[PDB]
Design a protein around this ligand. Structure first.
Ligand SMILES: [Cl-]
Ligand SMILES: [Cl-]
Lengths: 149, 8, 149, 8
C-alpha cells in the first residue's frame, strides 16, 4: 500500500482533468489535457513514476487498461497496471467525493487564474496541504519513509 | 489581465 | 535543509528544460518548455509546491528573480523566492555536472521517445531512482519525513 | 513509430 495509486478522470469546462490518487494518503497529482487518450495517460504515468515510487496503478477505465501505450509506459516505469473495479464499494464514493471537492476548490480559485491549468494546480496544492491533524502531503511522505526504513 | 498567471 | 530547492535551466534541441533540484537530496523534477518565461517558470513552481513542501526556491537567473509573475506564484504558494548566487562555489559545479548527467541520460533514451518531453521524463525517472546506497527519491522522502516527525 | 510515446 505505500506504492498503490488510482487514476481518476473528471471533466470541467469541456476539458479533462486527469488525477492520480495515492490511495493510502489521499495525496494527488493532476493535469489538464484536451482529451483522455492512451498517449496522454501514459505520459502522465511516466511523470508520476519518476516522482514517487509507484508500484501499482489502478486505471480509471477499461480503455486505459486496454491501451497498449498505457501498458508500454507501465512496463517502462516498472508499474503493475491493474483494473479499477471497486471491489470495495467505498472506493466509488471516495473518488466521487474527491472530484466534488476538487471542483469546489477550482471554483473558489477560478477567478485568480486565466487558464484552467493554473486553477487545477492551485486546487492540487490546497488539497494536498489541507489538514484533516496531518495533511495528505505529510501522510504520503510518512507512509513511504516508514516503508523505506 | 489581473490574474496570477497573467498579471496584465 | 528539507524545504530548499534550486531552479536550473538547460537547453537541448532548441528547447528549454527547466529543472528544480531539491538541494539536500539531489532529487529533481523537470519539464520541457519552448522558452523560459516568467509565466512558464511561475506555473512550474506552482506545480512543484503543490507536490512537495517547498519553503525556499533559489531562482536560476536574475530575470526569474525579478519577474513579478514568478514572485506572484511564490507569494501564492507560500515560497520564499531567493537569488541563486553560488556563495558556495561548489553549487556551480554540482549544477553543471547534473546538467551533463541529464543530457547523457536523455541521449541514452532519446531514440525510445518521439518527443523530447518523454525523453526528459525518462531521464528524471532514471536520475531519481539511481542508487549512489540510497536513491535521490529515497533521500528526499527520508529528509522530509524526518523533519515532519 | 516504434517509440514508447508513439507505438506506431
Ligand atoms: Cl475524453
Ligand atoms: Cl529561453
Amino acid at each position: 500500500s505505500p506504492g498503490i495509486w488510482q487514476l481518476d478522470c473528471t471533466h470541467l469546462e469541456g476539458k479533462v482533468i486527469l488525477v492520480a490518487v495515492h490511495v493510502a494518503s489521499g495525496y494527488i497529482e493532476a493535469e489538464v489535457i484536451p482529451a483522455e487518450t492512451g498517449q496522454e495517460t501514459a505520459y502522465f504515468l511516466l511523470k508520476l513514476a519518476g516522482r514517487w515510487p509507484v508500484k501499482t496503478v489502478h486505471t480509471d477505465n477499461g480503455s486505459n487498461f486496454t491501451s497498449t501505450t498505457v501498458k508500454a509506459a507501465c512496463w517502462w516505469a516498472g508499474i503493475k497496471q491493474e483494473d479499477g473495479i471497486p471491489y470495495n464499494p467505498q472506493s466509488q464514493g471516495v473518488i466521487e467525493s474527491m472530484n466534488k471537492e476538487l471542483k469546489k476548490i477550482i471554483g473558489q480559485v477560478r477567478d485568480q487564474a486565466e487558464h484552467l491549468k493554473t486553477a487545477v494546480q492551485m486546487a492540487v496544492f490546497i488539497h494536498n496541504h489541507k489538514r484533516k491533524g496531518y495533511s495528505a502531503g505529510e501522510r504520503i511522505v510518512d507512509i513511504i519513509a516508514t516503508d523505506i526504513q | 489581465a489581473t490574474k496570477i498567471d497573467n498579471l496584465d
